[PDB]
Scaffold this active site. Structure first.
Site, PDB file in Angstrom:
ATOM      1  N   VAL A  51       0.827  -1.209   0.000  1.00  0.00           N
ATOM      2  CA  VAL A  51       0.000   0.000   0.000  1.00  0.00           C
ATOM      3  C   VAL A  51       0.859   1.256   0.000  1.00  0.00           C
ATOM      4  CG1 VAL A  51      -1.333   1.500   1.535  1.00  0.00           C
ATOM      5  CG2 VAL A  51      -2.164  -0.818   0.924  1.00  0.00           C
ATOM      6  N   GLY A  52       2.071   1.163   0.541  1.00  0.00           N
ATOM      7  CA  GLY A  52       2.989   2.295   0.558  1.00  0.00           C
ATOM      8  C   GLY A  52       4.041   2.191   1.642  1.00  0.00           C
ATOM      9  N   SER A  53       5.079   3.012   1.521  1.00  0.00           N
ATOM     10  CA  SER A  53       6.168   3.026   2.497  1.00  0.00           C
ATOM     11  C   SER A  53       6.748   4.414   2.723  1.00  0.00           C
ATOM     12  CB  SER A  53       7.294   2.090   2.053  1.00  0.00           C
ATOM     13  OG  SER A  53       8.339   2.074   3.028  1.00  0.00           O
ATOM     14  N   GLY A  54       7.449   4.569   3.844  1.00  0.00           N
ATOM     15  CA  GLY A  54       8.083   5.843   4.193  1.00  0.00           C
ATOM     16  C   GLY A  54       9.102   5.665   5.299  1.00  0.00           C
ATOM     17  N   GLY A 106       7.760   2.879   8.138  1.00  0.00           N
ATOM     18  CA  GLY A 106       7.944   1.463   7.831  1.00  0.00           C
ATOM     19  C   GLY A 106       7.282   1.237   6.495  1.00  0.00           C
ATOM     20  N   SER A 107       7.058  -0.015   6.130  1.00  0.00           N
ATOM     21  CA  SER A 107       6.347  -0.343   4.886  1.00  0.00           C
ATOM     22  C   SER A 107       5.020  -0.943   5.304  1.00  0.00           C
ATOM     23  CB  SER A 107       7.090  -1.387   4.060  1.00  0.00           C
ATOM     24  OG  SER A 107       8.430  -1.014   3.871  1.00  0.00           O
ATOM     25  N   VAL A 108       3.991  -0.704   4.500  1.00  0.00           N
ATOM     26  CA  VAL A 108       2.668  -1.224   4.783  1.00  0.00           C
ATOM     27  C   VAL A 108       2.113  -2.071   3.641  1.00  0.00           C
ATOM     28  CG1 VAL A 108       0.307  -0.661   5.388  1.00  0.00           C
ATOM     29  CG2 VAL A 108       2.174   0.885   6.108  1.00  0.00           C
ATOM     30  N   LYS A 148       2.078  -3.438   8.943  1.00  0.00           N
ATOM     31  CA  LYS A 148       3.227  -2.549   8.869  1.00  0.00           C
ATOM     32  C   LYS A 148       4.500  -3.170   9.422  1.00  0.00           C
ATOM     33  CE  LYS A 148       3.396   1.320  11.355  1.00  0.00           C
ATOM     34  NZ  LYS A 148       3.088   2.782  11.524  1.00  0.00           N
ATOM     35  N   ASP A 187      -0.603   7.745  13.521  1.00  0.00           N
ATOM     36  CA  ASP A 187       0.667   8.478  13.812  1.00  0.00           C
ATOM     37  C   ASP A 187       0.762   9.318  15.104  1.00  0.00           C
ATOM     38  OD1 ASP A 187       2.554   7.774  11.670  1.00  0.00           O
ATOM     39  OD2 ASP A 187       1.122   8.707  10.289  1.00  0.00           O
TER      40      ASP A 187
HETATM   41  C1  LIG Z   1      -0.541  -0.893  11.791  1.00  0.00           C
HETATM   42  C2  LIG Z   1      -0.614  -1.075  10.414  1.00  0.00           C
HETATM   43  C3  LIG Z   1      -0.545   0.011   9.578  1.00  0.00           C
HETATM   44  C4  LIG Z   1      -0.433   1.285  10.117  1.00  0.00           C
HETATM   45  C5  LIG Z   1      -0.332   2.473   9.275  1.00  0.00           C
HETATM   46  N1  LIG Z   1       0.738   3.224   9.567  1.00  0.00           N
HETATM   47  N2  LIG Z   1       1.004   4.396   8.865  1.00  0.00           N
HETATM   48  C6  LIG Z   1       0.207   4.815   7.871  1.00  0.00           C
HETATM   49  N3  LIG Z   1       0.511   6.040   7.213  1.00  0.00           N
HETATM   50  C7  LIG Z   1       0.618   5.950   5.745  1.00  0.00           C
HETATM   51  C8  LIG Z   1       1.147   7.267   5.152  1.00  0.00           C
HETATM   52  N4  LIG Z   1       1.187   8.378   6.137  1.00  0.00           N
HETATM   53  C9  LIG Z   1       1.772   9.561   5.597  1.00  0.00           C
HETATM   54  N5  LIG Z   1       1.926   9.726   4.256  1.00  0.00           N
HETATM   55  C10 LIG Z   1       2.483  10.842   3.755  1.00  0.00           C
HETATM   56  C11 LIG Z   1       2.915  11.850   4.615  1.00  0.00           C
HETATM   57  C12 LIG Z   1       2.758  11.679   5.989  1.00  0.00           C
HETATM   58  N6  LIG Z   1       2.189  10.550   6.449  1.00  0.00           N
HETATM   59  C13 LIG Z   1       1.991   8.019   7.311  1.00  0.00           C
HETATM   60  C14 LIG Z   1       1.748   6.597   7.790  1.00  0.00           C
HETATM   61  C15 LIG Z   1      -0.910   4.048   7.559  1.00  0.00           C
HETATM   62  C16 LIG Z   1      -1.187   2.856   8.236  1.00  0.00           C
HETATM   63  C17 LIG Z   1      -2.450   2.175   7.815  1.00  0.00           C
HETATM   64  C18 LIG Z   1      -2.764   1.993   6.475  1.00  0.00           C
HETATM   65  C19 LIG Z   1      -3.972   1.414   6.113  1.00  0.00           C
HETATM   66  N7  LIG Z   1      -4.854   1.052   7.042  1.00  0.00           N
HETATM   67  C20 LIG Z   1      -4.588   1.244   8.347  1.00  0.00           C
HETATM   68  C21 LIG Z   1      -3.393   1.812   8.762  1.00  0.00           C
HETATM   69  C22 LIG Z   1      -0.347   1.474  11.490  1.00  0.00           C
HETATM   70  C23 LIG Z   1      -0.409   0.386  12.324  1.00  0.00           C
END
Ligand SMILES: c1ccc(-c2nnc(N3CCN(c4ncccn4)CC3)cc2-c2ccncc2)cc1
Ligand SMILES: c1ccc(-c2nnc(N3CCN(c4ncccn4)CC3)cc2-c2ccncc2)cc1
Ligand SMILES: Fc1ccc(-c2n[nH]cc2-c2ccncc2)cc1
Ligand SMILES: [Cl-]
Ligand SMILES: [Zn+2]
Length: 347
Positions: free
Chosen positions: A26-29, A32-34, A49, A164
């Site tokens: 779905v995406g990474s940064g 971590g990666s998701v 993640k 976050d």
């Molecule tokens: C467990 C599993 C996944 C996550 C999760 N963590 N981070 C996510 N975002 C995706 C992108 N997001 C972002 N993107 C661009 C700029 C700043 N922030 C920051 C982090 C989404 C997710 C996410 C994605 C999809 N559905 C639920 C959560 C957290 C805990």
């Protein structure tokens, strides 16, 4: 121990229990990666993640522990929580990777605002949800500190969850953000004693954007950001100026051509006046007079959704670890304990 399987997705390898199937990136940064996956045990679509370099430094190690502690504690409909957490490591010695699992949320508030102009009903419901989550987060003495559209997850049912809610004044350049359109002005002034209402300022900015389709304050740097802000709300009054200890910041602001507060009705023309009234209570320059999450929930704009009996607060949250100064291996051991001791929620 469950049965794990390995695969490589994009440039990231994944080792997860068999219960999770059909992983698709779905995406990474910096985080971590998701991957999205199908949880065969519960029938749910989940997001998995894999943390990036969790124990690279004391900063990563402590942040890894913090995220786990935060996610384990958050039990609220408008805040992401933990369905599962795992590592393929059989022991502490080989503990190198952490995987976190939560409900899959297919979009974020950017996709929503850019792909369509929301109706007032949608704005009310979405902002309502953010505030309900913040009320809960704030009640645990937690400040989000970086609320923005890409931190608000939203599904096809218009249900929203805050994500976050895991960084502080760090000494690293990974994840560095140039100018932040949703940040409280006191943060742009590097004030070291800001309160929970920094998040309310962000909500104000987000809400404005949902109503107008435009970023409220698209500043190019911290100073440009502050000037755009003062242009709307006006330059600080005597009471607020007196609260600025920083001689240079105070003097700079006072050396700006002074500006009056704009009439919000003229700026957000066409908007529900109840919405504009709330915006005005959120976008208050002096944090001490900015409305709180709990107070905002009781604003007439949310009369269709407000229910004091269904806007809960959080159990006590132990943040004493935040003051600890430990070795990477100590944070790693604590994190490992937290993985092994995780009790999934009842289905
Ligand atoms: C467990 C599993 C996944 C996550 C999760 N963590 N981070 C996510 N975002 C995706 C992108 N997001 C972002 N993107 C661009 C700029 C700043 N922030 C920051 C982090 C989404 C997710 C996410 C994605 C999809 N559905 C639920 C959560 C957290 C805990
Ligand atoms: C709870 C959730 C999922 C499982 C589960 N565990 N192991 C699974 N196997 C592991 C071993 N299996 C296998 N083993 C040897 C050769 C070829 N295939 C491949 C899939 C599948 C599954 C599985 C079950 C249901 N649907 C999809 C996958 C067990 C409990
Ligand atoms: F121009 C501005 C913009 C925001 C502030 C502000 N709002 N709440 C608290 C402060 C503040 C800023 C700097 N130092 C202490 C307090 C003060 C001046
Ligand atoms: Cl609050
Ligand atoms: Zn780093």
């Amino acid at each position: 121990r469950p049965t794990f399987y390995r695969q490589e997705l994009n440039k990231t390898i994944w080792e997860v229990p068999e219960r999770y199937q059909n992983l698709s990136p779905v995406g990474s940064g910096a985080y971590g990666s998701v991957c999205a996956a199908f949880d065969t045990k519960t029938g749910l679509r989940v997001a998995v993640k894999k943390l990036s370099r969790p124990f690279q430094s004391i900063i990563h190690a402590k942040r890894t522990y913090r995220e786990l502690r935060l996610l384990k504690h958050m039990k609220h409909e408008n805040v992401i929580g933990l369905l599962d957490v795992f590592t393929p490591a059989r022991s502490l010695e080989e503990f190198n990777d952490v995987y976190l699992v939560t409900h899959l949320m297919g979009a974020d508030l950017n996709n929503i605002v850019k792909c369509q102009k929301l109706t007032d009903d949608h704005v009310q419901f979405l902002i309502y949800q953010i505030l309900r989550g913040l009320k809960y987060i704030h009640s645990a003495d937690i400040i989000h500190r970086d609320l923005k559209p890409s931190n608000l997850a939203v599904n096809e049912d218009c249900e929203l969850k805050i994500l976050d809610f895991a960084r502080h004044t760090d000494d690293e350049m990974t994840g560095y953000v140039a100018t932040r359109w949703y940040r409280a002005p006191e943060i742009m002034l590097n004030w070291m004693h800001y309160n929970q209402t920094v998040d309310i300022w962000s909500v104000g900015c987000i809400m404005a954007e949902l109503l107008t389709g435009r970023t409220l304050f698209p500043g190019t740097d911290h100073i440009d950001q502050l000037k755009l802000i003062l242009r709307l709300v006006g330059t600080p009054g005597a009471e607020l100026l007196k609260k600025i200890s920083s001689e240079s910041a105070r003097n700079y602001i006072q050396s700006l051509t002074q500006m009056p507060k704009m009439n919000f009705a003229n700026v957000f023309i066409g908007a529900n006046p109840l919405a504009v009234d709330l915006l005005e209570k959120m976008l208050v320059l002096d944090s001490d007079k900015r409305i709180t999450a709990a107070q905002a929930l009781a604003h007439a704009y949310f009369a269709q959704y407000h229910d004091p009996d269904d806007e809960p607060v959080a159990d006590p949250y132990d943040q004493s670890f935040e003051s600890r100064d430990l070795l990477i291996d100590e944070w790693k051991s604590l994190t490992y304990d937290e993985v092994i001791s995780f009790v999934p929620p009842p289905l």
